Design a protein around this ligand. Structure first.
Ligand SMILES: Cc1cc2nc3c(=O)[nH]c(=O)nc-3n(C[C@H](O)[C@H](O)[C@H](O)COP(=O)(O)O)c2cc1C
Ligand code: SF4
Ligand code: SF4
Ligand code: SF4
Ligand code: SF4
Ligand code: FES
Ligand code: FES
Lengths: 59, 66, 54, 41, 230, 212, 430
């Protein structure tokens, strides 16, 4: 249970696991997350901009 | 211009000061010097509604759905 | 943890199938739980000394 | 009397309820009106 | 000269004739929690949330639609008032789907706020949880109809402000689909004002749909244009 | 069972649909029974006329009833989706209601359900690859005091057994129709022992009353 | 005071159970209709209400509200808004045939009684609501209306005297909820049948805004008999709160299941075996007995051998007496299965106004499925007990309450079969 790299996951042969539900930026105690979300042409709600500052991220 | 963020040259941009009466608000603002715009408080206006009036006979307030 | 789930968030199983535990997870991490008004103080023994917090 | 005095019900066609309502539409006192003819007029 | 005496937990206050328990309880500051009642429309009673143990009565009664006899005492903070709220709030979340991320009312739900502040925590109702598939009401209003808690707020708004009469209840028991039966894309005026009426995340804005969740955005006073009324 | 319309023509307004002027006279009798000011109260009997006229109501029937009673159609769509006697699917000539809940199910309607199933072939709740055999089981009707019951087009059949099922259904194939009343003798809802009811010809107004 | 009471002949309030001398107003006159009614009418409605509260009519249909209080609320001074009388004639509580017998064999006493009620409270027109199941009996009612109009004595200027009174008939469309007290009113209004809120009473706002009321059919039938007969002659049969004659019907599981008039109390063993054949398999074969119908908790064997049949008695047994289905059920079926099917009926007919009945009957339907298959833990059966404590009375109508009570009675009495069922499912999966 080390806390390192800030990686993402994805579904089994599937798309991006993030819904862009903004909880991580709502909790991020130095606000280093920056989420701007949009839907795409499909209909499932997704993102546009998912930025982690590594400076502010206290891990 | 590197990340698409909204910087500002406004240190005062995220002040908020929640008070309890208009008098002390104005007293503080004039005590600390800068100008101020007062908008007045607006309660919801009390009404006169009843379920029997939603069951009218020759009055047009009629529920029409349920 | 406490079983008073309105303070500590629940765990993953009930989180992935509840409704109340999902809502509690969601709002508990967005807003933060409400804390009744008043001023407290306490102090424990840090290995320095009186670690007090007010 | 131990015989089924009915079967007067037996002949009833599927229109007869509205037939009886149809023919018994005399002495219809005015079903008292009120202001507008309808809730929305 | 046209007064009614009530005690709100001992604190006396005076009530105009014919009004509700709820307007006087909101007169002393205690907002009894509500779902079907909203002051711009008539009074349904179908959300049942406003039960309050009003004395010398074994049956706990609604407060959005109670005539106010002289000399009440209105017990809000009792035992079985809380037990009735626990029961009702546990009943709402049975057939409501786990959508609070992809719901568009994360900061602005009503089940979320009032079920934190009034409800249970350990859920039950282990299996089941039916779902009603959505409709296509109008391309300006995105519409999910599994989250409809059938609260009959959009219906009364239609028939009593819009006058359009296109939304109806359909069915019995658990199966009450709410909408227009005939594949008609409902288009009328003030249909943009229905996404502010629907208290839960079941009628959202279509063009706004998935760009922000409302704790980030700051709120600011301004004056309208394009109509001469503001 | 799919409470949104989704046209599928042989529906799809306008399906051409109109009544008989005799039925128009029924219409005016019906909305002249109710008081003026509340014309919208005869929606269900007008819709009953539409069903009894044309065995199931299409959507153009609902537009017709709405323009006749000068209402928005949405109330008619509510009342159509709300009740039981109005079947928005097209049905056959004869309709079958196999009623079975509390005495009806415990007095072995499952024998009758098996009999109806393996005589007719089409499964429970469904329709048939001909007319006159839209079979649905239903909940309680009221006439419980006998064997579990059958409603066909405004008629009953009680005191059942699969040989009577064979007979009645072969005769509805043939076109001949037996009685609404009970079977196994006992010509009404009777105490079926040795007539434990009243026996004497009752007196009525003749004997001791008071103030009249 | 009687020793628990039984049928004493000719003290039957209404004869002609079935198929008697004719089916006619002439036979109604021979059996006791249209006799000296004008002298009762022209004394003033206050004396009619005095006659009824002298008789002390307990209200029927399984509620308990006495008729005298209701129709004494109906003594409002008549304003510009007319007064209406609504005769309810659905048969819920599956097992019923309460007034199916009455409206199939004698509509005339109902016509007499609705005339009585229309005089007795200032009513002006009476709408009679028949269930949609009953086209043929409804047309019998239509023939009787034609006979009473063709007599020229109801309709306009009744009994000769200048007193018009019109009566109509509205069909049902199939519901349990149209039988209730207020969803009836708005089902007549053309909107879909859904109850209102109670503290605006029907006697203040009713059908479109009229001071109206709703009578059960047995009240309509008993009304002109007590008007034409003596005061408290009705009251001589049974106790003091409840009084009079009632249809106790075994529609269910005995040899020759049938319907009988009796007095207000009866010993239950006489009631079951000494009138209607015998119990299927004898007295000791049955598992239990439900009184009332379907909105009533069960009564087990050790309670059914001793308890008399009064309204106060079934209050003392924590149940509620309704009508027409006071029946046994055998050990040979599982009472869990029977009550679970009744819960499925409750789901299939309930309106969707109140949240709690909607979702409570949803859970209880699925949980009784998981009990018939037996796939739960004992905390689930106490969970069902807790939720049946939550639902009760927290709705508009009493369908939710009458869904609370059977689960209650099953939990209060028949725990051991539930435990053995769950144990056998453990033996099955293991
Ligand atoms: C759960 C419920 C079901 C009812 N079902 C029926 C019914 O099937 N038929 C009927 O005539 N009345 C029905 N009623 C109404 C009662 O019979 C009620 O007692 C009636 O409105 C007046 O009867 P009373 O004045 O003699 O007590 C129902 C009421 C409730 C609460
Ligand atoms: S927005 Fe944040 S919390 Fe939500 S799915 Fe994406 S990474 Fe997870
Ligand atoms: S769509 Fe929304 S406002 Fe309308 S009944 Fe459903 S939950 Fe209420
Ligand atoms: S309305 Fe939206 S936020 Fe509220 S409980 Fe439903 S899915 Fe969650
Ligand atoms: S308890 Fe159920 S059936 Fe009764 S009024 Fe409420 S929602 Fe309707
Ligand atoms: S607020 Fe919905 S019931 Fe009173
Ligand atoms: S249950 Fe079959 S008719 Fe009542």
């Amino acid at each position: 249970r080390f806390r390192g790299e800030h990686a993402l996951r994805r579904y089994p042969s599937g798309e991006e696991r993030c819904i862009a539900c903004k909880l991580c930026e709502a909790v991020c105690p130095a606000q280093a997350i920056t989420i701007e979300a949009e839907p795409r042409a499909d209909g499932s709600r997704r993102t546009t901009r998912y930025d982690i500052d590594m400076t502010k991220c206290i891990y | 211009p590197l990340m698409g963020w909204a910087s500002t040259a406004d240190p005062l941009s995220n002040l908020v000061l929640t008070f309890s009466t208009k008098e002390d608000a104005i007293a503080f603002a004039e005590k600390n010097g800068w100008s101020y715009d007062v908008e007045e408080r607006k309660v919801p206006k009390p009404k006169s509604k009843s379920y029997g009036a939603n069951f009218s006979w020759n009055k047009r307030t009629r529920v029409s759905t349920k | 943890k406490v079983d008073d789930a309105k303070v500590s968030p629940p765990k993953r199983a009930e989180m992935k199938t509840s409704m109340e535990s999902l809502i509690h997870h969601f709002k508990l991490y967005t807003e933060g739980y409400q804390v009744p008004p008043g001023a407290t103080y306490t102090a424990i023994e840090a290995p320095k000394g009186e670690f007090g917090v007010y | 009397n131990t015989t089924y005095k009915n079967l007067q019900h037996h002949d009833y066609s599927t229109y007869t309820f509205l037939d009886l309502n149809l023919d018994l539409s005399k002495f219809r006192m005015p079903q008292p009106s009120s202001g507008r003819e309808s809730p929305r007029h | 000269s046209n007064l009614i005496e009530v005690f709100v937990d001992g604190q006396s206050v005076m009530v105009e004739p014919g009004t509700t328990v709820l307007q006087a309880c909101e007169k002393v500051g205690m907002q009894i929690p509500r779902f079907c009642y909203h002051e711009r429309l008539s009074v349904a009673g179908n959300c049942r949330m406003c039960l309050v143990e009003i004395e010398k009565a074994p049956k706990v009664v609604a407060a959005c639609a109670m005539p106010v006899m002289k000399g009440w005492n209105i017990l809000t903070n009792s035992e079985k008032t809380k037990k009735a709220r626990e029961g009702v709030m546990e009943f709402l979340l049975a057939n409501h789907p786990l959508d609070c991320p992809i719901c568009d009312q994360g900061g602005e739900c009503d089940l979320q706020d009032q079920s934190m502040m009034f409800g249970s925590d350990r859920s039950r109702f282990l299996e089941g949880k039916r779902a009603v598939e959505d409709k296509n009401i109008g391309p300006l209003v995105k519409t999910i109809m599994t989250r409809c808690i059938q609260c009959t707020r959009c219906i009364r708004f239609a028939s009593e402000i819009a006058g359009v009469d296109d939304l109806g209840t359909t069915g019995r028991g658990n199966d009450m689909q709410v909408g227009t039966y005939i594949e008609k894309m409902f288009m009328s005026e003030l249909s943009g004002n229905i996404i502010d009426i629907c208290p839960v995340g079941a009628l959202t804005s279509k063009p706004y749909a998935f760009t922000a969740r409302p704790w980030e955005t700051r709120k600011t006073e301004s004056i309208d244009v394009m109509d001469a009324v503001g | 069972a799919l409470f949104v319309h989704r046209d599928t023509p042989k529906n799809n307004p306008e399906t051409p649909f109109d009544f008989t002027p005799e039925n128009y006279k029924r219409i005016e009798a019906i909305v002249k029974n109710y008081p003026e000011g509340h014309k919208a109260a005869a929606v269900l009997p007008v819709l009953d006329l539409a069903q009894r006229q044309n065995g199931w109501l299409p959507i153009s029937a609902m537009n017709k009833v709405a323009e006749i009673l000068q209402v928005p159609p949405m109330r008619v769509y509510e009342v159509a989706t709300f009740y039981t006697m109005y079947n928005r699917k097209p049905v056959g000539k004869y309709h079958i209601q196999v009623c079975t809940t509390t005495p009806c199910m415990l007095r072995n309607s499952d024998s009758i359900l098996e009999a109806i199933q393996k005589k007719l072939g089409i499964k429970v709740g469904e329709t048939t690859p001909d007319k006159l055999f839209t079979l649905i089981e239903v909940e309680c009707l009221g006439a419980c005091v006998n064997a579990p019951m059958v409603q066909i087009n405004d008629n009953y059949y009680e005191d059942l057994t699969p040989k009577d099922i064979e007979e009645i259904i072969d005769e509805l194939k043939a076109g001949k129709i037996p009685k609404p009343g009970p079977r196994s003798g006992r010509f009404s809802c009777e105490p079926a022992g040795g007539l434990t009811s009243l026996t004497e010809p009752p007196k009525g107004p003749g004997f001791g009353v008071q103030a009249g | 005071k009687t020793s628990f009471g039984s049928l004493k002949d000719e003290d039957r309030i209404f004869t002609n159970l079935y198929g008697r001398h004719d089916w006619r107003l002439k036979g109604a006159q021979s059996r006791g209709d249209w006799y000296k009614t004008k002298e009762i009418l022209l004394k003033g409605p206050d004396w009619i209400l005095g006659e009824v509260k002298t008789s002390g009519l307990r209200g029927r249909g399984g509620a308990g509200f006495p008729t005298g209080l209701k129709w004494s609320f109906m003594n409002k001074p008549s304003d510009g808004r007319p007064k209406y009388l609504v005769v309810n004639a659905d048969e819920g509580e599956p097992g019923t045939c309460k007034d199916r017998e009455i409206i199939r064999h004698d509509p005339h006493k109902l016509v007499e009684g609705c005339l009585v009620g229309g005089r007795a409270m200032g009513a002006r027109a009476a709408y009679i609501y028949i269930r949609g199941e009953f086209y043929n009996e409804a047309s019998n009612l239509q023939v009787a209306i034609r006979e009473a109009y063709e007599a020229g004595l109801i309709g306009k200027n009744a009994c000769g005297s200048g007193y018009d009174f019109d009566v109509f008939v509205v069909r049902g469309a199939g519901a349990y909820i149209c039988g209730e007290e207020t969803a009836l009113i708005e089902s007549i209004e053309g909107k879909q049948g859904k109850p209102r809120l109670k503290p605006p009473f029907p006697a203040d706002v009713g059908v479109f805004g009229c001071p109206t009321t709703v009578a059960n059919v047995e009240t309509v039938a008993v009304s002109p008999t007590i008007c034409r007969r003596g005061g408290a002659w009705f009251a001589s049969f049974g106790r003091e709160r409840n009084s009079g004659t009632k249809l106790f019907n075994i529609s269910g599981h005995v040899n020759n299941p049938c319907t009988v008039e009796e007095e207000m109390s009866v010993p239950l063993k006489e009631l079951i075996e000494k009138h209607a054949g015998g119990v299927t398999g004898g007295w000791d074969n049955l598992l239990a007995v439900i009184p009332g119908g379907s909105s009533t908790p069960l009564i087990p064997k050790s309670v059914c051998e001793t308890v008399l049949m009064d309204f106060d008695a079934l209050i003392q047994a924590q149940t509620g007496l309704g009508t027409a289905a006071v029946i046994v059920m055998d050990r040979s079926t599982d009472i869990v299965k029977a009550i679970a099917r009744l819960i499925e009926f409750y789901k299939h007919e309930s309106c969707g106004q109140c949240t709690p009945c909607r979702e409570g009957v949803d859970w209880m339907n699925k949980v009784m499925a998981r009990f018939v298959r037996g796939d739960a833990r004992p905390a689930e059966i106490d969970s069902l007990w807790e939720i049946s404590k939550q639902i009760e009375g927290h709705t508009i109508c009493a369908l939710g309450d009458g869904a609370a009570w059977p689960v209650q009675g099953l939990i209060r009495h028949f725990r051991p079969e539930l435990e053995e069922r769950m144990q056998r499912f453990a033996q099955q999966h293991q």
